[PDB]
Every structure is written in structure tokens, then in C-alpha cells.
From a paper:
MaeK and MaeR exert their function by activating the expression of L-malate catabolic genes (maeP and maeE) and the expression of their own genes upon the presence of L-malate in the medium. Structural and phylogenetic analyses show that L. casei MaeKR proteins belong to the citrate family of TCS, as well as the characterized DcuSR and CitAB TCS. We also solved the crystal structure of the REC domain of MaeR in its activated state as well as the structure of a mutant version defective in the phosphoacceptor Asp. Altogether, our analysis has revealed that MaeKR is a non-canonical TCS conserved in Lactobacillales and that the structure of MaeR acknowledges the α4β5α5-swapped dimers as a new class of dimerization for RRs.
In an attempt to determine the MaeR unphosphorylated monomeric conformation, we performed crystallization studies of a MaeRREC mutant form where D54 was replaced by an alanine (MaeRREC-D54A). MaeRREC-D54A crystallized in the same space group and similar size dimension than the wild-type MaeRREC. The determination of the structure of MaeRREC-D54A by molecular replacement revealed the presence of a swapped dimer into the unit cell identical to the one obtained for the wild type MaeRREC (RMSD is 0.52 Å for 242 residues). The crystals were obtained at high concentrations of sulfate (1.6 M) and it is well known that sulphates can mimic phosphate ions. No interactions with the conserved Asp9 were observed due to the absence of a magnesium ion in the active site. The residues Thr82 and Tyr101 forming the Y-T switch present the inward conformation as in the MaeRREC-BeF structure, confirming an activated state for MaeRREC-D54A. The fact that the non-phosphorylatable mutant also adopts a dimeric swapped conformation indicates that this conformation is not induced upon phosphorylation. On the contrary, it supports that the swapping by itself generates the conformation competent for phosphorylation where the active site displays an organization able to accept the phosphoryl group. This notion is further supported by the coordination of a sulphate ion in the absence of a phosphorylatable Asp in the MaeRREC-D54A crystals. EMSA assays showed that the D54A mutant had completely lost the capacity to bind the mae promoter.
Numbering used by the authors:
A (entry chain B), B (entry chain A): 0 to 121
The structure:
Amino acid sequence: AATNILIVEDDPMVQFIHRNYLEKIGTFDTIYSSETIADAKKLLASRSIQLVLLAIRLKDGNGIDFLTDLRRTKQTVDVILITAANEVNIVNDALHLGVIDYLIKPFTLERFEKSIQRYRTK
Amino acid sequence: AATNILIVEDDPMVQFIHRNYLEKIGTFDTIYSSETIADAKKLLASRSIQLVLLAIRLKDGNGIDFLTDLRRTKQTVDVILITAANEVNIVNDALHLGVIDYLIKPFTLERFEKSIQRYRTK
């Protein structure tokens, strides 16, 4: 390969885990670390990077918003998300849309009324 | 007791299931049906609706896009997403963000390289 990878992740242990794993395949030369979006933006403008490993919860901002920006400016960067956030998190915490509950299909009857009683509590 | 619901789902079977399940609790007077965003919007301007059971893959557009407009217009409405779409679908199909992969934390030793292999083939 011989390609550049930027890791953007808040927790330094998981940063080390991506670092370790990428060298355990080890096709790639330079591996950059960043704990903030502000660092990541400046690193992209500094050294040319091929792929990016991005989280959603960073210290300074939201990962999904940064990716939105990254596509608007039409960056020569291939992004792959490594994140704890599920569907419910993307809608509420990342898109700020304010959904009561995210029902996954297929669903059981008990899960449906669980999602209905969540409305009543609001 | 006594509240309004609009179902917006493109397939009429799952529409009947939502209807059947809402009555199998039954806190509600009227339950409205819709197969498009267009039919839903017109109902929202028309009759009083408290909560909305919204899908993502609708006939005339994307449910997440309809939700975004619904909040930018600031509608007095309680969305509850009932959908088969995962995180990857919200990022790429619903937000068009051209992501290579989505690893849900925590990830396996091996699933990391599969996610990298999806970069190697692009």
C-alpha cells in the first residue's frame, strides 16, 4: 500500500489500539494521531493523508459534523468510522433531531410499548 | 389518554402492524396513515398530530431528511423512528457521507482488517 492514515479519537488507549492494529496488518507507512478536530483539520492541511479513522465523540466537537465539512470541501480523504455511537446516538446526539425512540425492524410487541411509554414520560 | 398519531411508512403491511400494535395498547382516538412524505406533510398542515411514527426509506424521499425539515420548521411533533436502517444507512444512504465502513465499539481483532480491506478495494 504505502499510504497515510490519520487517527482521530479522544481516548488515548483506543488511539493506541488503532495504532497497534494498523501495524498488525502493517501495509502503511505513516500513522498520525489527533485527539481533536482542530488538530485533525490542521494535520490534513499540513501532511497529505489518504484515509482517516474517525470517532463521533471528540473533546472539541462532533465527528459527524466534521465529516460533513470534509465532504463539503471535497477532500481527497477516505473516511472509515470507528465509534461507540448507535443509530439512536446519530439522530439525537449527532444530528440533534430529538427523536423519542429508534425502533429497529424487526421488533417484538414488548419493545413497541416500551417505545410508547417513552412518549408518555415526556 | 386521547392523543393523535400519524404513521408514515411506504409498505402497507408494516403500516397495518403499527396500527394493530397501537390499538393493542389503545391510548389513542385516531391513527393516520401515510405512504409518502408528501401525504404526511399535507396531513401535518391539516389535522392535529402529537406523535409521528416515521420510517426512513419512503417512496418520495428520505425519512431523516423529512425529520430535518420538520425541526427546521419547528413543528409541535414527537417523532419516533421505526426503521430497518442501521448506522451505516444513516451515514451513507441518508446523509451521503461516502464512509468506507462503520465499526461499532467494541470491535473484534479480525473485524478491524475487514474494515481496512474495504478501503483496499477503493
